[PDB]
Amino acid sequence: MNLTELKNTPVSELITLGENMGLENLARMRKQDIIFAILKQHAKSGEDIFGDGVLEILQDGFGFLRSADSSYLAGPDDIYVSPSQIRRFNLRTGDTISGKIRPPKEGERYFALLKVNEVNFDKPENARNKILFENLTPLHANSRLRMERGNGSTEDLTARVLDLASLIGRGQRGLIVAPPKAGKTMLLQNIAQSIAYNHPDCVLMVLLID
Amino acid sequence: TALQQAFDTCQNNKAAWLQRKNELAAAEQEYLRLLSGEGRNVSRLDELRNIIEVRKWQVNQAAGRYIRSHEAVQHISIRDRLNDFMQQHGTALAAALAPELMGYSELTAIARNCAIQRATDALREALLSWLAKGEKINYSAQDSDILTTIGFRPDVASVDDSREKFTPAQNMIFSRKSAQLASRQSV
Ligand SMILES: Nc1ncnc2c1ncn2[C@@H]1O[C@H](COP(=O)(O)OP(=O)(O)OP(O)(O)=S)[C@@H](O)[C@H]1O
Ligand SMILES: [Mg+2]
């Protein structure tokens, strides 16, 4: 079973699954605590349990592994990562790690990982021999990122005006200088929808602050 | 041996232009095939279009170079044939042009130029009269093969491809895009 599969489930499932596994009062506490309790209960049975997420390196190799759907929130369900396998696999911050996870021992309250079977959606040996980002030589934008959806949507006029106004391509560095109450949120929403529709290959990330 | 150099330079230019037209046609055909497909492939189609104009510009450049080299080799052969025909029959020629071509060694610039102009247009009436009576002009025997493989005129598929009149700005923009395309193809 997948920890990510648990985290993608809604909150009410704690009644359906947590109570069915013998837990007593998972109704009243924070969701990550419910996830921790259910996955501890399942781990006590002994079946193999999967895990995955984005790696974080602390100031002293006290590595952690967070989940994307939880907005990388520091919670009990975070996966511990000792410096030993960090050195062995030459890992660093931002690495997507997937594989086995281990139930915590005495004195530990975080689920460590037994062995990784996927790094950055690739084999660990293929991920190890990859050069650093900053060593890559930049260039100007070459491939055009057309925002015209082409589905004839009633809101597609925004994307069309965007295409006529400012061309967007791979590798640009863009700014949207707007006042409050101007339409930034749904302009970015239309941009994201057009990117998801026209260009399913490129990885799309949206980041929201305060 | 300069005529042979011009000849095989023109042959190389023609081969290069044919090759350029080859990948241009291939790119156009595959772009049409992808457009006919059900998949969207927006970036695929956009960069394929860009490749299409890059290949079109390369074809234009190759055709222009081929036409220029063909004209150059024709001019070189004309100069050589007319020069040694001078070396053959120039005594009789200048005898026919005697009443105004004398004194050229010491005449003034204006007099020399006007005498040359009179000689030129007189040759014009003579030549147009010979073309008017109308025999079939035959190629020079010494260079007949070299001047007949290149053809009387450059191929029409090259002439119709040299009417775009690209501006210099577009010229170096397309050169930069072609260099970037070659670099991407190498990778
Ligand atoms: N393309 C559009 N079609 C229809 N209504 C639009 C469109 N763009 C903006 N609006 C309206 O204009 C307002 C824009 O609201 P938002 O995009 O939420 O503002 P904002 O850019 O997020 O700035 P904030 O968050 O309020 S400071 C709303 O009242 C929308 O209904
Ligand atoms: Mg907003």
Description:
This is part of a larger assembly, with chains A (210 residues) and B (187 residues). With 210 residues, chain A is α+β, with helices and mostly antiparallel strands. Helix content of chain A is 30%, strand content 12%. A 6-stranded mixed beta sheet of chain A has the order 5-3-2-1-4-6. The relative contact order of chain A is 0.09. Chain B has 187 residues and is mainly alpha-helical. Chain B has a single domain (1-187), classed as Methane Monooxygenase Hydroxylase, Chain G, domain 1 (Up-down Bundle). The longest helix of chain B has 55 residues, at 42-96. The structure holds phosphothiophosphoric acid-adenylate ester and magnesium ion. Magnesium ion binds at residues 184-185 of chain A. Chain A: One of its GO terms (biological process) is DNA-templated transcription termination. Chain A: Residues 48-123 form the Rho RNA-BD domain. Chain A: Homohexamer. The homohexamer assembles into an open ring structure.
Number of domains of chain B: 1
Main sheet specs of chain B: none
CATH superfamily of chain B: Phage polarity suppression protein monomer
Say how many strands of chain A there are: 6
Strand content of chain A: 5-15%
Structure classification of chain B: mainly alpha
Most strands sheet of chain A: 6 strands, mixed
- List all distinct small molecules, including ions and cofactors, that are bound in this structure: phosphothiophosphoric acid-adenylate ester, magnesium ion
